[PDB]
Symmetry: C4
Subunit: 140 residues, 4 copies
């Protein structure tokens, strides 16, 4: 239900960002690449979030733009790819790279990244191409 | 536990509304009809919410008045009718229309709506009327 | 983790109270007797809360003072007595009445209240007397 | 998801601290030692929190610095050591003491503490040292 956070950056420790909204310091997990776009500590930042709820955990995944949040959400809809794996994918390549690689069935791109899986990569490419046709965005 | 939200409409993408309360952007799901009654982005809005908690998710369902929220709450108590589907009963037709239908028993009206159920249309009328005599409201 | 709420009273509909903190309207469930102590709608109120979390629900129980919250918490530690039953007990008699009745093994007091239970009353009286010796408060 | 709280200390009843952030009084559980380092009621405090979520409960564990929070997090990963018990390891003895004990392997020190375990004392030392070489901090 939390889709956006606007507050002050308190500390950056990739992959974590502590962002204070009110006096509540929230822990947000972001793709490594997103840390090059973040305002310096002490300044205000707007991050798009995805709230993942489980019986034993309440986590927040944060993106600089909505395009990347969409990608992440679709990514974790596939079996074998959870939040942690989706983060590495988006840390390992831009949003545009991933789309370009998926569109031409480039499995080689994905097997380089951390603990992906040869068969999972192929699986990922089929599903994502099917999933991409029903949406919109700046990244396309 | 969250009964109401008052904040700034950040964005409106039916069926989602992004309302910022403090610096927390809350995602609210409303019936489509409710969407056209809301102010414009930048302005303050007051929505009556229904919080649904499950193992995998925390969701907010938003309404322009308490009469719609009550109807919503009762709709989802019947079997085969979840939030997704109850949204359509108030998305596809106003609140006022629906209550007449149950009291008069017009099954034809409710069958046109999105994937409801011809027997569930019957089910709704039967089931809804019992609950309708135990409440109060402007909708009546 | 939420132990207190300080905000504006928006509406009172026993057993519910909507109290707005920030722009977040929180639903609080209080014993009927507590409604005679609540500031009028539009004014600030401080309520002591008990957060009950279950897989499908997130609820807030609110008291005017900490003594009553303690009582409620101990009450629901007994089998057969859940939040709903503990509310009726505290709606049916003051905090002092309940302690006075428990101390002299007065089961008659408790069987009058709504859906208690003859055997549950006796059970309640034994446990509460044992439980009362390890605490403190204005009500004693 | 909540990494830090900044607000007004409302009350201090070891082991609970009531800190008001906005109008929300949050209950924070801290090790007893941490309790004597906190400011007085009425003043602002900054605490590093660890949020534990379970089916029946939402809890906040609070610390005066990140070194104690890290130690806490690692303590509760070992079997037979829950939050209740880890509080005592930092309540009964400082953070600094404990890390020496694991590196030197002094089992006598940790057996005095509240109901730990003579074999669990051994367990702690054995188990803790593996984890201690994979981190960083002022406590070291």
């Amino acid at each position: 239900m939390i889709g956006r956070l606007r507050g002050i950056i308190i500390e950056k420790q990739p992959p974590l960002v502590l962002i204070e909204v009110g006096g509540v310091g929230y822990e947000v997990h972001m793709p490594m690449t997103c840390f090059y776009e973040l305002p310096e500590a002490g300044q205000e930042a707007i991050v798009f979030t995805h709230f993942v709820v489980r019986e034993d955990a309440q986590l927040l995944y944060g993106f600089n733009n909505k395009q990347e949040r969409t990608l992440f959400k679709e990514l974790i809809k596939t079996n074998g790819v959870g939040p942690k794996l989706a983060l590495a994918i988006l840390s390992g390549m831009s949003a545009q790279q991933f789309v370009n690689a998926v569109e031409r069935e480039e499995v080689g791109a994905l097997v380089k990244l951390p603990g992906i899986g040869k068969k999972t990569a192929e699986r990922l490419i089929v599903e994502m191409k099917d999933r991409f046709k029903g949406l919109h965005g700046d990244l396309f």
